[PDB]
Design a protein around this nucleic acid. Sequence first.
DNA 1: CGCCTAGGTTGGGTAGGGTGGTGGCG
DNA 2: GTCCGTGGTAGGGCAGGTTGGGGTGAC
Lengths: 28, 249
Amino acid sequence: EADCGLRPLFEKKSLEDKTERELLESYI
Amino acid sequence: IVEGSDAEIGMSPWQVMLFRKSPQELLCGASLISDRWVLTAAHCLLYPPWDKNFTENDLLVRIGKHSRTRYERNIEKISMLEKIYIHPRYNWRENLDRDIALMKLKKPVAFSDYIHPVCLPDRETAASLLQAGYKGRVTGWGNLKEGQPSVLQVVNLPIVERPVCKDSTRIRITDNMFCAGYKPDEGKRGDACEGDSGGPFVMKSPFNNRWYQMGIVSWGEGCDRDGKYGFYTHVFRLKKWIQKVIDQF
DNA sequence: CGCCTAGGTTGGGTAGGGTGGTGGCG
DNA sequence: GTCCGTGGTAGGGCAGGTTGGGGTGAC
Ligand SMILES: *C[C@@](*)(O)[C@H](CCCNC(N)=[NH2+])NC(=O)[C@@H]1CCCN1C(=O)[C@H](N)Cc1ccccc1
Ligand SMILES: *[C@@H]1O[C@H](CO)[C@@H](O)[C@H](O)[C@H]1NC(C)=O
Ligand code: NA
Ligand code: NA
């Protein structure tokens, strides 16, 4: 629960998914 | 999921499958918020209009799955319900207001590289991410049109201005739901469909790089229609309820 | 022996794979 | 400025519970 929102095969491996950025680039 | 695409293995480790024992059919989607608590849509358990009303003993929970049908050995983990908790305010007749519900598992689930919980949002996270234009992610093994995908689908949809949401449907909108999707002149397409209900509408915080469930796939007129948009249950406004339910039970 | 596609609470992607231990054929 | 409870999705009883808060507030 205190380790939530962190995917073991991504955030925890300092790797991004192929569509993430689209979400982050939408913050304006 | 319409105008989506095959998800990357382990990119949605909180994604839960609400499976009906007999007959063995996929009922809805859901999210894993802790080791024994799973969040889903109330209309997935109780909807009299279609004489729908399931008990804990009638349903099954499949976590860490990617393939919709096939049994994924040593990866997929199956759990059963001890008790169901449907919000006492859930209005199934008019506008599915507060279309939310908690499901307590009989035994705590073991986390893996394919099984992990999503974060519930606080008032700050909810005040930063809940804005028109801000895109969210929706996943589910629902219909591709108004047929059924092979592997878990995923699509990115932007939050729409409430006025647009309201004037897009004859149904009466509440402060406990928000609509998301692309507009007609936006060119890009996508939306959720039948069987995607209970699925999470997650957003990644650009402050702590953590995924937060902001909404729950609720309703919508048809699927991926022009002028029409999909509605999601406002998770934050109900967290208070979730908190004391998980607490007292 | 390497190809070929295959049951199970289970496809065929290949005999590993995000997971065990399994063949028949030429 | 005002409005967001006494039946509704529904009991018993006018509060408060797993529920009537508060917020991207909406009007
Ligand atoms: C139960 C869910 O799988 C499903 C999801 C629909 C999502 N659609 C889009 N475009 N994202 N929900 C439903 O089918 C809900 C539950 C029962 C009725 N329903 C509807 O969407 C109706 N078609 C519309 C509606 C009926 C009553 C109250 C509000 C909306
Ligand atoms: C749903 O089924 C349960 C268990 O039988 C029952 O107690 C409850 O009254 C039913 N609810 C509706 C609205 O039919
Ligand atoms: Na196999
Ligand atoms: Na009441």
